[PDB]
Design a protein around this nucleic acid. Sequence first.
DNA 1: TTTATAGCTAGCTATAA
DNA 2: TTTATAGCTAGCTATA
Lengths: 63, 62
Amino acid sequence: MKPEELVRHFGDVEKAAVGVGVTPGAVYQWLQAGEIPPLRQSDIEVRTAYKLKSDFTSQRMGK
Amino acid sequence: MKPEELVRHFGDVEKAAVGVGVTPGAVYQWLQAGEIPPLRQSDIEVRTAYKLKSDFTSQRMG
DNA sequence: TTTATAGCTAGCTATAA
DNA sequence: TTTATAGCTAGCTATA
């Protein structure tokens, strides 16, 4: 999943940082990079009960 | 998931290490500690197509 | 609220038995 | 094969 999809999912940056257990500064860094680091994407996919999918899972499932 | 479940799943430490994209020495650390680090547990769950469950998922389904 | 970035350390890899 | 641990940096937190 892309940082903007994470922000849509929880509603804003503050709620996204609380939703995945980081500081807002981590979410702004993902947004600026246009990318969530890979173990983090797995952890977000797990912690959201797969409502958000990692790039790994989307690729594996054939997009 | 516990480090013993991870190793039983792949067959041995070498195969576990290849299976989750780490060196065997990372797997020996998890076994000796008795725990796999949290983000790592999530990655193993995703990379095994949910065949192994993180402690988080195990607890949530309980 | 967001940007920019210094500064730290968990959790790896590398190594030497 | 496994132990013990040094060497190291990605990816955070803390800040300004």
